[PDB]
Amino acid sequence: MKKRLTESQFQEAIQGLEVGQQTIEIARGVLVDGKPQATFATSLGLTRGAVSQAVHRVWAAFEDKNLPEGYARVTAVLPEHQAYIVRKWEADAKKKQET
Amino acid sequence: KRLTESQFQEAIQGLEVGQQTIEIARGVLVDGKPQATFATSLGLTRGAVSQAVHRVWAAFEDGYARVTAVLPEHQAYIVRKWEADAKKKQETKR
């Protein structure tokens, strides 16, 4: 990452999305305001996983609408060395997209 | 087999599930009720119930990191196979 969205991108993300208002507020706070997830867990009395779950739903909604040709979205838990390779792949991807 | 409420609380913190999953897991692992009671009461498959209980138990039992990325399809498929091969390894390990 970082994983960020403008308000305009955020609206596109939730456009026609089945999602509750609390999920939206957390998602907004994390993705467009840039706040850490742990703060929303503490303030709202939610587990860190519930918060992560809310952020992911909106982020995924956006990406699924903005996948370049030949690309796909993945979320997965991986041993650290594999996570390292993914980051490299992600960075390489981004440079090509930019170009 | 079983968990304390203290252990239960600890195990559910990182889980991305709905309250139903959590409540089934409490009933089975903390209060000790059979799984089939929840499949029957709620109208769930036994698989959905076993999966709910397992997620919570595995969280108690268990060099890893969470990644989220958009990649060229060939790499996306590899991540999914890695994840799969990793969970079947963590299934046995020994």
Residue numbers in the entry:
A (entry chain A): 1 to 99
B (entry chain D): 3 to 64, 70 to 101
Publication excerpt:
Gene expression in the IncP-1 plasmids is stringently controlled by a network of four global repressors, KorA, KorB, TrbA and KorC interacting cooperatively. KorA is a 101-amino acid, homodimeric, protein with an N-terminal DNA-binding domain (DBD), containing a helix-turn-helix motif, and a C-terminal dimerization region, joined by a linker of four amino acids. In this study, we have determined the structures of the free KorA repressor and two complexes each bound to a 20-bp palindromic DNA duplex containing its consensus operator sequence. The structure of KorA consists of two domains, joined by a highly flexible, four amino acid linker, which retains its mobility even when bound to DNA.
The crystals of free KorA contained two dimers in the asymmetric unit (ASU), each with two N-terminal DNA Binding Domains with four α-helices and a C-Terminal Dimerization domain containing a single β-strand and the final helix from each monomer. The NOEs correlate with the X-ray crystallographic B factors for the protein and confirm that the linker is flexible. The structure of each domain is well-determined from the NMR data, and is consistent with the crystal structures. The structures of the DBD (residue 6–66) from both techniques fit with an RMSD of 0.92 Å, while the CTD structures (residues 71–98, dimer) fit with an RMSD of 2.9 Å. When the protein is removed from the DNA complex, the DBDs collapse towards each other, giving additional fluctuating contacts which keep the protein compact. Dynamic interactions observed between the two DBDs include salt bridges between R57 and E18 and hydrogen bonds between R48 and Q11/Q15. The mobility of the KorA DBDs, in the absence of DNA, is likely to be due in part to the different possible electrostatic interactions between the two domains, giving rise to multiple conformers of similar energy.
